[PDB]
């Protein structure tokens, strides 16, 4: 019955498009469709001096990479899970599944 699908992605526009596409698919099948849950973004960061030597005013930069994520929890029969999984390929988004 239940499935939880994690769409994980370090680009916001892609994840927004792919989730809108999958939401449209859900509402076109109409199994009591719903929005995705927007997850707390993972943020990995590094802070370093700009100059390659000691000279000048010490100026510092913070680089941060953001891994966005969205979860769909959903009700489907096993055939529809097996058949719909054909949607979950050729994406820069990484896709993962949980089941009970």
Output 64 or 79, the one with its CB closest to RNA.
64
- Verify binding: residue 44, another protein, rule CB under 8 A: yes
Per DSSP, the residues of the chain read: -EEEEEEEES-HHHHHHHHHHHHHHHHHH-SS--PPEEPPPEEEEEEEESSSSS-SS--EEEEEEEEEEEEEEEE--HHHHHHHGGGS-S-SSEEEEEE-
Tell me if 60 sits within 8 A of 49, measured CB to CB.
yes
82 binds, among another protein, RNA, none (CB under 5 to 8 A by kind): none
Breaks (C-N over 2.5 A) in the chain follow: none
Output 54 or 100, the one with its CB closest to another protein.
54
- Verify binding: residue 51, RNA, rule CB under 7 A: yes
Tell me the window of 2-10, 57-65, 77-85, 89-97 that interacts with RNA (CB under 7 A): 57-65
Binding mask 47-86 for another protein (x = CB under 8 A): -xxx-x----xxxxxxxxxx--------------------
Residues that bind another protein (CB under 8 A): 10, 44, 46, 48-50, 52, 57-66
């Amino acid at each position: 019955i239940n499935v939880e699908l994690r769409l994980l992605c370090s680009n916001k526009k892609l994840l927004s498009d792919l989730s809108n596409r999958y939401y449209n698919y859900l509402f076109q099948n109409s199994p009591t469709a719903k929005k995705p849950r927007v997850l707390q973004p993972f943020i990995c960061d590094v802070t370093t001096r700009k100059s390659p030597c000691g000279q000048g005013t010490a100026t510092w930069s913070k680089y941060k990479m953001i891994i966005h994520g969205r979860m769909f929890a959903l009700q489907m029969t096993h055939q529809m899970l097996k058949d719909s999984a054909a949607f979950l390929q050729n994406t820069d988004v990484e896709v993962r599944l949980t089941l009970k």
